[PDB]
């Protein structure tokens, strides 16, 4: 009767010890996660793809400008002769 | 006396099982967090706003260049004529 | 015999209450970590250094364009008189 209670107490202690270990483990796993305060969210940042597309847009305008410059240099050389 | 111990044992078993469930749940919530090792910190990356401001600066120079080009094309058409 | 069981019961109650508190704490610490769903990984985004290098490349083409534009403006002024 009393020994049956002792066996159940031992059982409980074991389950508690397991729980304490799961908690110690969880605390360490938490330490490996990035804090909201030190990381930008998706709404605050562009992806590589998005940046790539914006850079192409600029490169295009620059190509347009260079081709206009080259055409103007040719016109000037014709006027000169 | 012994029944009072049994009641308390039942109470403890219930709590333990609730605790175990809270822990299983916590483990799942941890798995949805990003690791420090796989995410850039705020000092490593620019925000959308910062990129937008850098792109604007460039777009504004490009506009200035295009307006100079349009002016030059006009001068050249006058010289020719 | 019965008092030895009571002592062990007291010990278990104490630990459980501590555990419940550690869990409440842990839940709050978890809320401060960034979710995988709201953060980009390192391979999805460019760093400041990488963006800086792409912006330099563009600035160099712009410098080249400006000097050509300045030279062309001078030629045009000479042709005019």
Swiss-Prot record, chains A, B, C:
Phosphorylated by the cyclin-CDK PCL5-PHO85. Disruption phenotype: Abolishes recruitment of the mediator complex to the upstream activating sequence (UAS) of amino-acid starvation responsive genes. Decreases RNA level of genes involved in amino acid biosynthesis and cofactor biosynthesis during amino acid starvation or methyl methanesulfonate stress. Growth dependent on amino acid supplementation. Sensitive to amino acid starvation. Sensitive to purine starvation. Decreases cellular glycogen levels during glucose starvation. Residues 2-81 form the bZIP domain. Residues 5-79 are annotated as: Leucine-zipper. Induction: Translation is induced by amino acid or purine starvation, or during growth in low or poor carbon sources. Translational repression during nutrient-rich conditions is dependent on four uORFs (upstream open reading frames) present in the 5'-UTR of the mRNA; these promote ribosome dissociation. Translational induction occurs in conditions reducing translation machinery efficiency, leading to ribosomes scanning over the uORFs, and increased translation of the mRNA. The rapid translational induction is followed by transcriptional induction at later time-points, independently of the uORF sequences. It comes from the Eukaryota. Signal peptide: none annotated. It is found in: Nucleus. Master transcriptional regulator that mediates the response to amino acid starvation. Binds variations of the DNA sequence 5'-ATGA[CG]TCAT-3' in canonical nucleosome-depleted 5'-positioned promoters, and also within coding sequences and 3' non-coding regions. During nutrient starvation (low or poor amino acid, carbon or purine sources), it activates genes required for amino acid biosynthesis and transport, autophagy, cofactor biosynthesis and transport, mitochondrial transport, and additional downstream transcription factors. Homodimer. Each subunit binds overlapping and non-identical half-sites that flank the central CG base-pair in the pseudo-palindromic motif 5'-ATGA[CG]TCAT-3'. Interacts with the mediator tail; the interaction with GAL11/MED15 is direct. Interacts with the SAGA histone acetyltransferase complex. Interacts with the SWI/SNF chromatin remodeling complex. Belongs to the bZIP family. GCN4 subfamily. Residues 89 to 100 and 106 to 125 define the N-terminal activation domain (NTAD) and the central acidic activation domain (CAAD) respectively, which can function independently to promote high-level transcription of the target genes. This is General control transcription factor GCN4. It comes from Saccharomyces cerevisiae (strain ATCC 204508 / S288c) (Baker's yeast).
């Amino acid at each position: 009767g009393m020994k049956q209670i002792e066996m159940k107490i031992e059982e409980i202690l074991s389950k508690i010890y397991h729980i304490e270990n799961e908690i110690a483990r969880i605390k360490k796993l938490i330490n490996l996660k990035a804090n909201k305060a030190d990381a930008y969210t998706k709404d605050q940042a562009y992806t590589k793809t998005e940046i790539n597309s914006q850079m192409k847009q600029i490169e295009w305008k620059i190509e347009e400008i260079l081709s206009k410059i080259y055409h103007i240099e040719n016109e000037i050389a014709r006027i000169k002769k």
